[PDB]
């Protein structure tokens, strides 16, 4: 037959997974989740090759059996949960919160997060639809549908959704003074203010982003993430702080130890 495929070869493991060539034959194909397979990783990989909590897949299963891992302040049990672009994952046995961030080098990395700021996740809505009786709903990259949004919120804005009540708090728009992340660009991991946009008739629209070192780059409109306005990046960025570090002077920094 020609049904939906159910395996991924180890060589065909996605780019940012960073899995060894000889360590077996197959990598897990994430079950249908809230985020795309090409841009999210399973919790098994996340806690194995980064957290290093266990040494075998079955040990990871035994960990997952206890209702200790939590996503968006609620319980999850299936070993194939892609964490997604932005979220919060909580572990109560150690009372530690992790939040998924990127690197200027193009990967996924967990970031230690305190309890107060661990209750806030930022979601970029992807679609705006109208339902029966004039109620407007927003569909997010998070695979989450938020009904009854403000008339203020537009398509590309980002929304301060609370984890527990499942309700909006505030909106953040996309002026030339709004901090935006790049999701899957070849220059992924750069934090900038965006100098301006460039809308093209019936095609992709290219937006220019400016950095803290006056570097200017361009990116497709599809894969941007409103993270905060000119005041500050609202959430805690990783150690690299989202500024991309040039190769030669990066080698200089590495050499100078």
Partner RNA sequence: AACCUGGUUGAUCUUGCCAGUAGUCAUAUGCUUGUCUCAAAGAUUAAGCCAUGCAAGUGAAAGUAUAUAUAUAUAUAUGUAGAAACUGCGAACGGCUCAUUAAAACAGUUAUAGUCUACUUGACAUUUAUAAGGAUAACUACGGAAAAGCUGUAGCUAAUACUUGCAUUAUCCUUUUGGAUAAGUAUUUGUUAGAAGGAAUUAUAACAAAGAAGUAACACGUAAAGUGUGUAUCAAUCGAGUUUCUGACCUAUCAGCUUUUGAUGUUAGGGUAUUGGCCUAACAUGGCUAUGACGGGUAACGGGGAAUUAGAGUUCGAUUCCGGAGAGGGAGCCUGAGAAAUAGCUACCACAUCUAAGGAAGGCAGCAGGCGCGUAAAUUACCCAAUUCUAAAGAAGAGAGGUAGUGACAAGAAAU
Partner RNA sequence: UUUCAAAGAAUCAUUCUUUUUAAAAUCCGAUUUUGUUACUUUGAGUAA
Partner RNA sequence: AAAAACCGUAAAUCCUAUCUUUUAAAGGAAGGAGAAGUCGUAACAAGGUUUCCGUAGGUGAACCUGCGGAAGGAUCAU
Partner RNA sequence: AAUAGAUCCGUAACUUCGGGAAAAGGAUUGGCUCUGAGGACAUUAAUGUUAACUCAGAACUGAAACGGACAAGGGGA
Cβ proximity to RNA: between 153 and 235 the closer is 153
247 touches RNA (CB under 7 A): no
Cβ-contact 63, 51 below 8 angstroms: no
Measured from the CB of residue 44, what is the shortest distance to RNA in angstroms? 6
128 touches RNA (CB under 7 A): yes
Q: What are the CA-CA distances from residue 249 to residues 73, 102, 252, 254 (Å)?
A: 41, 21, 5, 8
How much is the CA Rg of the chain, to the nearest whole Å?
19
Residues near 214 by beta carbon (within 8 Å), at least 6 away in sequence: none
212 touches RNA (CB under 7 A): no
CA–CA separation, 18 and 178 (whole Å):
32
11 touches RNA (CB under 7 A): yes
Cβ proximity to RNA: between 7 and 252 the closer is 7
Residues 35-64 that bind RNA (CB under 7 A): 35-38, 44-45, 56-58, 61-62
132 touches RNA (CB under 7 A): yes
Cβ proximity to RNA: between 186 and 256 the closer is 186
Q: Which of 51, 68, 197, 218 binds RNA (CB under 7 A)?
A: 218
239 touches RNA (CB under 7 A): no
Q: Which of 30, 118, 158, 178 binds RNA (CB under 7 A)?
A: 30
Select from 257, 256, 193, 201 the least CA-distant residue to 224: 193
**Residue 41: exposed, middle, or buried by beta-carbon count in 10 A (0-12, 13-18, 19+)?**
buried
Phi, psi values for residue 202, rounded to 5°: 70, 25
1 touches RNA (CB under 7 A): yes
Stretch that binds RNA, among 72-80, 115-123, 230-238, 239-247 (CB under 7 A): 72-80
CA–CA separation, 90 and 26 (whole Å):
28
CA–CA separation, 90 and 149 (whole Å):
27
Cβ proximity to RNA: between 26 and 230 the closer is 26
Stretch that binds RNA, among 4-12, 86-94, 116-124, 168-176 (CB under 7 A): 4-12
Residues of each annotated binding site: 58
| Binding site residue list for Mg(2+) | 58
């Amino acid at each position: 037959g020609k049904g939906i495929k159910k395996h991924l070869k180890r060589v065909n493991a996605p780019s940012h997974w960073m899995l060894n060539k000889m360590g077996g034959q197959y990598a897990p194909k994430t079950s249908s989740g809230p985020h795309k397979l090409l841009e999210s990783i399973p919790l098994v990989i996340l806690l194995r090759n980064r957290l290093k909590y266990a040494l075998t897949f079955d040990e990871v299963k035994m960990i997952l059996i206890q209702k200790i891992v939590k996503v968006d302040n609620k319980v999850r049990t299936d070993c194939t949960f892609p964490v997604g672009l932005m979220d919060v994952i909580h572990i109560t046995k150690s009372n530690e919160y992790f939040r998924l961030l990127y690197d200027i080098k193009g990967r996924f990395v967990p970031h230690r997060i305190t309890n107060e700021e661990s209750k806030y996740k930022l979601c970029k809505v992807k679609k705006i639809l109208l339902r029966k009786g004039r109620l407007s709903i927003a569909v997010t990259h998070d695979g989450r549908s938020i009904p009854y949004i403000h008339p203020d919120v537009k398509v590309n804005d980002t929304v301060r959704l609370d984890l527990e009540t499942g309700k909006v708090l505030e909106h953040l728009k996309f002026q030339v003074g709004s901090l935006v992340m790049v999701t899957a660009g070849h220059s992924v991991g750069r934090v900038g203010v965006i100098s301006s946009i460039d809308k093209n008739m019936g095609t992709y629209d290219i937006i220019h982003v400016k950095d803290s070192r006056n570097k200017v780059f361009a990116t497709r409109l599809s894969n941007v993430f409103v993270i905060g306005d000119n005041t500050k990046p609202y959430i805690s960025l990783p150690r690299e702080k989202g500024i991309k570090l040039d190769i030669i002077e990066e080698r200089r920094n590495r050499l100078k130890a």
